[PDB]
Amino acid sequence: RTTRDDLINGNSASCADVIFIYARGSTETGNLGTLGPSIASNLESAFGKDGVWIQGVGGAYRATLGDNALPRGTSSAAIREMLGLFQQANTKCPDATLIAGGYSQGAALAAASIEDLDSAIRDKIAGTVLFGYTKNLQNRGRIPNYPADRTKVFCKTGDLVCTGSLIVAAPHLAYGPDAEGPAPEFLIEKVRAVRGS
Template sequence: MKSFVVLSLLATALAAPANTFQERQLDLSSLTSALKSTSSGAAGSSGSTGSTGTATTSGSSGLSALASLFPSSSATTSSSGSTSSSGSDDGLSGIISSFTSGSSTENGVTSHTGACKELTFIFARGTTEIGNMGTVVGPEVASKLQSLTGNQVTVQGVNYAADWAGIMSMGSDGGTEMVTYVKEALSQCPNTKVVLGGYSQGSMVVHYAANQLSAGQVTAAVLFGDPFKMLSVGKLASSKVKEFCASGDPVCENGMNVMAHLSYGSDATAAAEFLVQAAGVSS
Protein backbone atom coordinates (compact mmCIF):
# COMPACT_ATOMS: atom_id res chain seq x y z
CA MET A 1 0.00 0.00 0.00
CA LYS A 2 2.78 2.45 0.87
CA SER A 3 4.40 1.80 -2.51
CA PHE A 4 1.21 2.75 -4.29
CA VAL A 5 0.89 5.93 -2.24
CA VAL A 6 4.45 6.86 -3.18
CA LEU A 7 3.75 6.05 -6.83
CA SER A 8 0.66 8.23 -6.81
CA LEU A 9 2.53 11.16 -5.27
CA LEU A 10 5.38 11.01 -7.76
CA ALA A 11 3.14 10.43 -10.75
CA THR A 12 1.00 13.43 -9.82
CA ALA A 13 4.01 15.72 -9.55
CA LEU A 14 5.62 14.50 -12.77
CA ALA A 15 2.54 14.41 -14.95
CA ALA A 16 0.89 17.66 -13.87
CA PRO A 17 1.23 20.42 -16.49
CA ALA A 18 3.94 22.97 -15.82
CA ASN A 19 5.08 25.92 -17.87
CA THR A 20 8.75 25.86 -16.96
CA PHE A 21 11.47 23.54 -15.72
CA GLN A 22 11.72 25.80 -12.67
CA GLU A 23 8.10 24.98 -11.78
CA ARG A 24 8.87 21.27 -12.12
CA GLN A 25 11.87 21.68 -9.83
CA LEU A 26 9.71 23.30 -7.18
CA ASP A 27 7.08 20.56 -7.50
CA LEU A 28 9.66 17.79 -7.07
CA SER A 29 11.49 19.55 -4.26
CA SER A 30 8.23 19.83 -2.34
CA LEU A 31 7.48 16.20 -3.13
CA THR A 32 10.74 14.94 -1.63
CA SER A 33 9.65 15.63 1.95
CA ALA A 34 6.30 13.95 1.38
CA LEU A 35 7.98 10.90 -0.14
CA LYS A 36 10.38 10.55 2.77
CA SER A 37 7.65 10.79 5.40
CA THR A 38 5.38 8.40 3.49
CA SER A 39 8.00 5.69 3.04
CA SER A 40 9.95 5.95 6.29
CA GLY A 41 10.95 2.41 7.10
CA ALA A 42 8.98 1.12 4.11
CA ALA A 43 11.67 -1.20 2.85
CA GLY A 44 10.79 -3.92 5.32
CA SER A 45 12.89 -6.83 6.48
CA SER A 46 13.61 -8.12 2.99
CA GLY A 47 15.22 -4.84 1.94
CA SER A 48 15.15 -3.02 -1.40
CA THR A 49 17.83 -2.77 -4.06
CA GLY A 50 18.84 0.57 -5.51
CA SER A 51 20.83 1.39 -8.65
CA THR A 52 24.10 0.44 -6.98
CA GLY A 53 22.79 -3.00 -6.07
CA THR A 54 23.10 -2.34 -2.32
CA ALA A 55 20.22 -3.61 -0.19
CA THR A 56 18.84 -1.49 2.61
CA THR A 57 16.38 -2.57 5.27
CA SER A 58 15.15 0.60 6.88
CA GLY A 59 14.75 4.31 6.31
CA SER A 60 14.68 4.02 2.50
CA SER A 61 13.61 7.14 0.64
CA GLY A 62 10.36 7.31 -1.27
CA LEU A 63 12.25 7.10 -4.53
CA SER A 64 13.89 3.86 -3.43
CA ALA A 65 10.49 2.41 -2.57
CA LEU A 66 9.20 3.50 -5.97
CA ALA A 67 12.23 1.98 -7.69
CA SER A 68 11.04 -1.51 -6.77
CA LEU A 69 7.97 -1.00 -8.97
CA PHE A 70 9.97 -0.38 -12.15
CA PRO A 71 12.56 -2.43 -14.09
CA SER A 72 15.87 -2.11 -12.30
CA SER A 73 19.37 -3.35 -12.77
CA SER A 74 22.45 -3.33 -10.64
CA ALA A 75 24.39 -2.22 -13.70
CA THR A 76 25.62 1.34 -13.87
CA THR A 77 27.10 3.08 -16.87
CA SER A 78 30.08 5.40 -16.57
CA SER A 79 30.60 8.50 -18.66
CA SER A 80 32.98 6.52 -20.84
CA GLY A 81 30.20 4.11 -21.74
CA SER A 82 31.52 1.10 -19.81
CA THR A 83 29.04 -0.87 -17.74
CA SER A 84 29.77 -2.28 -14.31
CA SER A 85 27.55 -4.10 -11.88
CA SER A 86 27.26 -5.20 -8.30
CA GLY A 87 24.58 -7.13 -6.48
CA SER A 88 21.93 -9.02 -8.42
CA ASP A 89 19.49 -7.99 -11.15
CA ASP A 90 15.81 -8.30 -10.29
CA GLY A 91 15.31 -10.16 -13.56
CA LEU A 92 12.71 -7.83 -15.09
CA SER A 93 15.16 -6.06 -17.38
CA GLY A 94 16.36 -9.44 -18.57
CA ILE A 95 12.83 -10.55 -19.32
CA ILE A 96 12.14 -7.37 -21.27
CA SER A 97 15.41 -7.63 -23.21
CA SER A 98 14.47 -11.13 -24.39
CA PHE A 99 11.62 -9.58 -26.38
CA THR A 100 13.65 -6.80 -27.97
CA SER A 101 16.09 -6.66 -30.84
CA GLY A 102 19.18 -4.50 -30.99
CA SER A 103 21.89 -3.78 -28.47
CA SER A 104 21.47 -2.16 -25.07
CA THR A 105 24.70 -0.23 -25.77
CA GLU A 106 25.39 1.83 -28.90
CA ASN A 107 28.24 4.29 -29.46
CA GLY A 108 28.04 5.11 -33.15
CA VAL A 109 28.88 8.77 -32.64
CA THR A 110 31.62 8.51 -30.03
CA SER A 111 33.34 5.68 -31.93
CA HIS A 112 32.76 7.18 -35.37
CA THR A 113 34.51 5.19 -38.10
CA GLY A 114 34.20 7.73 -40.90
CA ALA A 115 31.09 6.40 -42.65
CA CYS A 116 28.31 9.01 -42.60
CA LYS A 117 24.69 7.89 -42.52
CA GLU A 118 21.49 9.69 -43.52
CA LEU A 119 20.17 9.61 -39.96
CA THR A 120 21.74 9.84 -36.52
CA PHE A 121 19.52 8.51 -33.74
CA ILE A 122 20.49 9.58 -30.21
CA PHE A 123 18.51 7.92 -27.42
CA ALA A 124 18.33 8.40 -23.64
CA ARG A 125 17.20 5.36 -21.64
CA GLY A 126 14.95 5.28 -18.58
CA THR A 127 15.87 5.11 -14.91
CA THR A 128 18.05 2.12 -13.95
CA GLU A 129 18.00 0.60 -17.45
CA ILE A 130 21.16 -1.21 -18.55
CA GLY A 131 23.75 -0.14 -21.13
CA ASN A 132 23.17 3.28 -22.66
CA MET A 133 20.10 2.32 -24.73
CA GLY A 134 18.16 0.36 -22.11
CA THR A 135 15.89 -2.55 -23.00
CA VAL A 136 12.30 -1.31 -22.87
CA VAL A 137 12.16 0.54 -26.20
CA GLY A 138 15.47 2.14 -27.31
CA PRO A 139 17.09 -0.88 -29.01
CA GLU A 140 13.84 -1.81 -30.75
CA VAL A 141 13.39 1.67 -32.25
CA ALA A 142 17.01 1.65 -33.44
CA SER A 143 16.53 -1.78 -35.04
CA LYS A 144 13.35 -0.66 -36.81
CA LEU A 145 15.09 2.47 -38.09
CA GLN A 146 17.90 0.38 -39.56
CA SER A 147 15.36 -1.88 -41.24
CA LEU A 148 13.38 1.00 -42.70
CA THR A 149 16.41 2.85 -44.07
CA GLY A 150 18.62 -0.01 -45.22
CA ASN A 151 21.04 0.48 -42.31
CA GLN A 152 21.48 4.18 -42.97
CA VAL A 153 21.40 5.13 -39.28
CA THR A 154 24.15 5.93 -36.80
CA VAL A 155 22.93 5.05 -33.30
CA GLN A 156 24.21 6.57 -30.06
CA GLY A 157 22.94 5.97 -26.54
CA VAL A 158 23.40 8.65 -23.91
CA ASN A 159 26.03 7.65 -21.37
CA TYR A 160 24.59 8.99 -18.11
CA ALA A 161 23.82 7.53 -14.70
CA ALA A 162 20.04 7.26 -15.23
CA ASP A 163 19.66 6.76 -11.49
CA TRP A 164 16.86 7.87 -9.19
CA ALA A 165 18.78 10.91 -7.95
CA GLY A 166 19.04 12.06 -11.55
CA ILE A 167 15.29 12.65 -11.72
CA MET A 168 15.80 15.70 -9.53
CA SER A 169 18.19 17.21 -12.08
CA MET A 170 15.26 17.74 -14.47
CA GLY A 171 17.15 16.26 -17.40
CA SER A 172 20.45 18.08 -17.04
CA ASP A 173 22.05 14.81 -15.93
CA GLY A 174 22.36 13.36 -19.40
CA GLY A 175 21.11 16.42 -21.24
CA THR A 176 24.54 17.98 -21.49
CA GLU A 177 25.90 14.68 -22.86
CA MET A 178 23.14 14.55 -25.47
CA VAL A 179 23.96 18.09 -26.58
CA THR A 180 27.60 17.05 -27.00
CA TYR A 181 26.61 14.03 -29.13
CA VAL A 182 24.37 16.14 -31.38
CA LYS A 183 27.13 18.66 -32.04
CA GLU A 184 29.71 15.90 -32.52
CA ALA A 185 27.47 14.06 -34.99
CA LEU A 186 26.91 17.21 -37.05
CA SER A 187 30.63 18.00 -36.99
CA GLN A 188 31.44 14.51 -38.26
CA CYS A 189 28.66 14.40 -40.84
CA PRO A 190 27.18 17.84 -41.64
CA ASN A 191 24.47 16.34 -43.87
CA THR A 192 23.16 13.78 -41.39
CA LYS A 193 19.75 14.44 -39.87
CA VAL A 194 19.77 14.09 -36.09
CA VAL A 195 16.70 12.61 -34.43
CA LEU A 196 16.27 12.14 -30.71
CA GLY A 197 14.48 9.64 -28.52
CA GLY A 198 13.91 9.29 -24.81
CA TYR A 199 12.07 7.00 -22.43
CA SER A 200 10.83 8.05 -18.99
CA GLN A 201 13.71 9.98 -17.34
CA GLY A 202 15.34 9.87 -20.77
CA SER A 203 12.50 12.04 -22.07
CA MET A 204 13.51 14.68 -19.54
CA VAL A 205 17.02 14.45 -20.98
CA VAL A 206 15.65 15.12 -24.48
CA HIS A 207 13.70 18.17 -23.28
CA TYR A 208 16.77 19.59 -21.56
CA ALA A 209 19.05 18.97 -24.54
CA ALA A 210 16.61 20.34 -27.09
CA ASN A 211 16.36 23.57 -25.09
CA GLN A 212 20.13 24.00 -25.32
CA LEU A 213 20.35 23.45 -29.08
CA SER A 214 19.71 25.79 -31.98
CA ALA A 215 16.88 25.47 -34.46
CA GLY A 216 17.81 23.04 -37.19
CA GLN A 217 20.30 20.98 -35.18
CA VAL A 218 17.61 18.41 -34.37
CA THR A 219 15.13 17.23 -37.00
CA ALA A 220 12.59 15.24 -34.95
CA ALA A 221 12.02 13.47 -31.64
CA VAL A 222 10.01 10.59 -30.17
CA LEU A 223 9.27 10.39 -26.45
CA PHE A 224 7.88 7.51 -24.41
CA GLY A 225 6.27 7.83 -20.96
CA ASP A 226 7.34 11.47 -20.88
CA PRO A 227 6.73 13.27 -17.55
CA PHE A 228 7.12 16.58 -19.44
CA LYS A 229 4.72 15.72 -22.25
CA MET A 230 2.86 19.02 -21.83
CA LEU A 231 6.03 20.98 -22.64
CA SER A 232 7.47 21.74 -26.07
CA VAL A 233 10.68 20.01 -27.16
CA GLY A 234 13.08 22.89 -27.64
CA LYS A 235 12.50 24.69 -30.93
CA LEU A 236 11.01 21.69 -32.71
CA ALA A 237 7.61 22.19 -34.30
CA SER A 238 4.89 20.03 -32.77
CA SER A 239 4.61 18.17 -36.10
CA LYS A 240 8.19 16.96 -35.60
CA VAL A 241 7.53 15.48 -32.14
CA LYS A 242 5.58 12.33 -31.34
CA GLU A 243 4.63 11.49 -27.76
CA PHE A 244 3.75 7.94 -26.75
CA CYS A 245 1.82 7.80 -23.47
CA ALA A 246 0.15 4.48 -22.69
CA SER A 247 -3.25 4.46 -21.04
CA GLY A 248 -2.83 4.23 -17.28
CA ASP A 249 0.88 5.13 -17.30
CA PRO A 250 1.58 6.69 -13.85
CA VAL A 251 4.44 8.82 -15.19
CA CYS A 252 2.81 10.59 -18.14
CA GLU A 253 -0.91 10.16 -17.46
CA ASN A 254 -1.46 10.11 -13.69
CA GLY A 255 -2.59 6.51 -14.01
CA MET A 256 -1.96 3.58 -11.68
CA ASN A 257 -0.97 0.87 -14.15
CA VAL A 258 2.76 0.40 -13.62
CA MET A 259 2.97 -2.18 -16.40
CA ALA A 260 1.73 0.43 -18.88
CA HIS A 261 5.01 2.27 -18.34
CA LEU A 262 6.86 -0.83 -19.55
CA SER A 263 4.78 -1.36 -22.69
CA TYR A 264 6.47 0.98 -25.15
CA GLY A 265 8.34 -1.68 -27.09
CA SER A 266 5.06 -2.22 -28.94
CA ASP A 267 5.30 1.37 -30.23
CA ALA A 268 8.78 0.96 -31.73
CA THR A 269 7.62 0.51 -35.32
CA ALA A 270 5.29 3.52 -35.20
CA ALA A 271 8.06 5.63 -33.64
CA ALA A 272 10.62 4.61 -36.26
CA GLU A 273 8.19 5.25 -39.10
CA PHE A 274 7.44 8.70 -37.68
CA LEU A 275 11.14 9.62 -37.45
CA VAL A 276 11.85 8.48 -41.01
CA GLN A 277 8.87 10.47 -42.31
CA ALA A 278 9.62 13.56 -40.23
CA ALA A 279 13.25 13.55 -41.37
CA GLY A 280 12.28 13.12 -45.01
CA VAL A 281 14.42 10.03 -45.42
CA SER A 282 13.35 7.46 -48.02
CA SER A 283 12.44 4.04 -46.65
Protein backbone atom coordinates in the same frame (compact mmCIF):
# COMPACT_ATOMS: atom_id res chain seq x y z
CA ARG B 1 22.94 -5.85 -27.07
CA THR B 2 21.77 -2.65 -25.39
CA THR B 3 24.83 -0.55 -26.28
CA ARG B 4 25.53 1.26 -29.56
CA ASP B 5 28.18 3.95 -29.98
CA ASP B 6 28.07 4.33 -33.78
CA LEU B 7 28.62 8.08 -33.69
CA ILE B 8 31.53 8.02 -31.24
CA ASN B 9 33.13 5.16 -33.18
CA GLY B 10 32.24 6.39 -36.66
CA ASN B 11 34.71 7.74 -39.21
CA SER B 12 33.77 11.19 -40.54
CA ALA B 13 35.16 10.17 -43.93
CA SER B 14 32.23 7.75 -44.19
CA CYS B 15 29.29 9.44 -42.47
CA ALA B 16 25.87 7.83 -42.34
CA ASP B 17 22.98 9.81 -43.88
CA VAL B 18 20.98 9.52 -40.65
CA ILE B 19 22.15 9.76 -37.02
CA PHE B 20 19.82 8.66 -34.20
CA ILE B 21 20.62 9.75 -30.63
CA TYR B 22 18.62 7.98 -27.93
CA ALA B 23 18.33 8.29 -24.14
CA ARG B 24 17.24 5.31 -22.04
CA GLY B 25 14.93 5.23 -19.01
CA SER B 26 15.91 5.33 -15.35
CA THR B 27 17.80 2.27 -14.25
CA GLU B 28 18.05 0.78 -17.76
CA THR B 29 21.07 -1.12 -19.07
CA GLY B 30 23.63 -0.26 -21.72
CA ASN B 31 22.95 3.06 -23.36
CA LEU B 32 19.83 1.92 -25.20
CA GLY B 33 17.83 0.14 -22.49
CA THR B 34 14.73 -1.83 -23.47
CA LEU B 35 13.21 0.26 -26.25
CA GLY B 36 16.24 1.55 -28.12
CA PRO B 37 17.21 -1.76 -29.81
CA SER B 38 13.73 -2.16 -31.31
CA ILE B 39 13.82 1.35 -32.84
CA ALA B 40 17.35 0.75 -34.15
CA SER B 41 16.60 -2.49 -36.03
CA ASN B 42 13.66 -0.82 -37.79
CA LEU B 43 15.78 2.19 -38.78
CA GLU B 44 18.51 -0.16 -40.02
CA SER B 45 15.92 -1.99 -42.16
CA ALA B 46 14.81 1.31 -43.72
CA PHE B 47 18.15 3.05 -44.26
CA GLY B 48 20.56 0.12 -44.37
CA LYS B 49 23.10 -0.80 -41.67
CA ASP B 50 25.55 1.66 -43.22
CA GLY B 51 22.92 4.34 -43.81
CA VAL B 52 22.20 5.03 -40.14
CA TRP B 53 24.30 5.47 -36.99
CA ILE B 54 22.69 4.53 -33.67
CA GLN B 55 24.06 6.34 -30.61
CA GLY B 56 22.79 5.87 -27.08
CA VAL B 57 23.47 8.54 -24.47
CA GLY B 58 26.04 7.06 -22.16
CA GLY B 59 28.94 8.63 -20.33
CA ALA B 60 27.70 11.03 -17.66
CA TYR B 61 24.06 9.90 -18.06
CA ARG B 62 23.74 7.37 -15.24
CA ALA B 63 19.90 7.20 -15.48
CA THR B 64 19.53 7.48 -11.73
CA LEU B 65 16.08 7.30 -10.10
CA GLY B 66 16.88 10.29 -7.91
CA ASP B 67 17.69 12.58 -10.85
CA ASN B 68 14.02 12.55 -11.85
CA ALA B 69 13.42 15.00 -8.99
CA LEU B 70 15.89 17.60 -10.31
CA PRO B 71 14.48 20.78 -11.99
CA ARG B 72 14.23 19.54 -15.54
CA GLY B 73 13.65 15.90 -14.77
CA THR B 74 17.31 14.93 -15.11
CA SER B 75 20.84 16.10 -14.20
CA SER B 76 22.81 18.96 -15.72
CA ALA B 77 25.67 16.49 -16.32
CA ALA B 78 23.34 14.22 -18.41
CA ILE B 79 22.02 17.20 -20.41
CA ARG B 80 25.65 18.18 -21.14
CA GLU B 81 26.41 14.66 -22.31
CA MET B 82 23.51 14.68 -24.78
CA LEU B 83 24.27 18.22 -26.01
CA GLY B 84 27.81 17.04 -26.63
CA LEU B 85 26.54 14.13 -28.74
CA PHE B 86 24.38 16.44 -30.91
CA GLN B 87 27.40 18.72 -31.28
CA GLN B 88 29.66 15.78 -32.20
CA ALA B 89 27.13 14.63 -34.81
CA ASN B 90 27.04 18.07 -36.42
CA THR B 91 30.83 18.34 -36.31
CA LYS B 92 31.55 14.90 -37.76
CA CYS B 93 28.66 14.76 -40.21
CA PRO B 94 27.25 18.18 -41.02
CA ASP B 95 25.09 16.83 -43.87
CA ALA B 96 23.48 14.06 -41.80
CA THR B 97 19.83 14.31 -40.77
CA LEU B 98 19.44 13.87 -37.02
CA ILE B 99 16.60 12.07 -35.19
CA ALA B 100 16.23 11.62 -31.44
CA GLY B 101 14.27 9.80 -28.79
CA GLY B 102 14.02 8.99 -25.15
CA TYR B 103 12.04 6.97 -22.63
CA SER B 104 11.03 8.09 -19.12
CA GLN B 105 13.90 10.12 -17.59
CA GLY B 106 15.44 9.80 -21.06
CA ALA B 107 12.42 11.60 -22.53
CA ALA B 108 12.95 14.48 -20.04
CA LEU B 109 16.67 14.42 -21.02
CA ALA B 110 15.91 14.57 -24.76
CA ALA B 111 13.50 17.46 -24.14
CA ALA B 112 16.01 19.43 -22.03
CA SER B 113 18.87 18.88 -24.43
CA ILE B 114 16.85 19.94 -27.45
CA GLU B 115 15.60 23.00 -25.56
CA ASP B 116 19.21 24.13 -24.85
CA LEU B 117 20.65 23.08 -28.22
CA ASP B 118 22.08 25.61 -30.70
CA SER B 119 19.13 26.42 -33.00
CA ALA B 120 21.17 25.74 -36.12
CA ILE B 121 21.76 22.13 -35.01
CA ARG B 122 18.23 21.80 -33.60
CA ASP B 123 16.88 22.57 -37.09
CA LYS B 124 18.64 19.40 -38.30
CA ILE B 125 16.66 17.12 -35.98
CA ALA B 126 13.91 15.93 -38.30
CA GLY B 127 11.87 14.22 -35.59
CA THR B 128 11.93 13.17 -31.94
CA VAL B 129 9.91 10.41 -30.25
CA LEU B 130 9.21 10.45 -26.51
CA PHE B 131 7.88 7.46 -24.53
CA GLY B 132 6.44 7.89 -21.01
CA TYR B 133 7.42 11.56 -21.11
CA THR B 134 7.85 12.62 -17.47
CA LYS B 135 7.30 16.28 -18.34
CA ASN B 136 4.28 15.70 -20.58
CA LEU B 137 1.82 17.65 -18.42
CA GLN B 138 4.33 20.33 -17.39
CA ASN B 139 5.41 21.00 -20.97
CA ARG B 140 1.88 20.49 -22.35
CA GLY B 141 3.08 17.66 -24.58
CA ARG B 142 5.80 19.77 -26.18
CA ILE B 143 9.58 19.91 -26.32
CA PRO B 144 10.51 23.57 -25.59
CA ASN B 145 11.79 25.44 -28.68
CA TYR B 146 10.89 22.54 -30.97
CA PRO B 147 7.91 22.28 -33.39
CA ALA B 148 4.89 20.13 -32.67
CA ASP B 149 4.97 18.51 -36.11
CA ARG B 150 8.41 16.99 -35.47
CA THR B 151 7.34 15.70 -32.05
CA LYS B 152 5.63 12.40 -31.30
CA VAL B 153 4.73 11.64 -27.69
CA PHE B 154 3.69 8.13 -26.61
CA CYS B 155 1.92 8.42 -23.28
CA LYS B 156 -0.40 5.61 -22.23
CA THR B 157 -3.62 5.95 -20.26
CA GLY B 158 -2.69 5.04 -16.70
CA ASP B 159 0.94 6.06 -17.05
CA LEU B 160 1.09 8.56 -14.16
CA VAL B 161 4.34 10.20 -15.24
CA CYS B 162 2.46 11.67 -18.22
CA THR B 163 0.02 13.23 -15.85
CA GLY B 164 2.39 15.18 -13.58
CA SER B 165 3.44 12.54 -11.10
CA LEU B 166 6.58 10.43 -10.70
CA ILE B 167 4.84 7.19 -9.71
CA VAL B 168 5.70 4.25 -11.94
CA ALA B 169 2.69 2.10 -12.78
CA ALA B 170 2.34 -0.84 -15.18
CA PRO B 171 1.36 1.25 -18.24
CA HIS B 172 4.78 2.96 -17.96
CA LEU B 173 6.35 -0.38 -18.87
CA ALA B 174 4.16 -1.06 -21.90
CA TYR B 175 5.91 0.91 -24.66
CA GLY B 176 7.61 -2.05 -26.37
CA PRO B 177 5.09 -2.36 -29.23
CA ASP B 178 5.21 1.40 -29.84
CA ALA B 179 9.00 1.32 -30.13
CA GLU B 180 8.92 -1.43 -32.77
CA GLY B 181 6.10 0.01 -34.86
CA PRO B 182 4.70 3.58 -34.86
CA ALA B 183 7.77 5.27 -33.35
CA PRO B 184 10.25 4.25 -36.05
CA GLU B 185 7.65 4.79 -38.82
CA PHE B 186 7.22 8.38 -37.62
CA LEU B 187 11.00 8.98 -37.56
CA ILE B 188 11.47 7.46 -41.04
CA GLU B 189 8.69 9.67 -42.39
CA LYS B 190 10.22 12.80 -40.85
CA VAL B 191 13.64 11.98 -42.31
CA ARG B 192 12.13 11.67 -45.79
CA ALA B 193 10.17 14.91 -45.38
CA VAL B 194 13.33 16.94 -44.71
CA ARG B 195 15.64 15.08 -47.08
CA GLY B 196 13.07 14.95 -49.84
CA SER B 197 12.80 11.86 -52.05
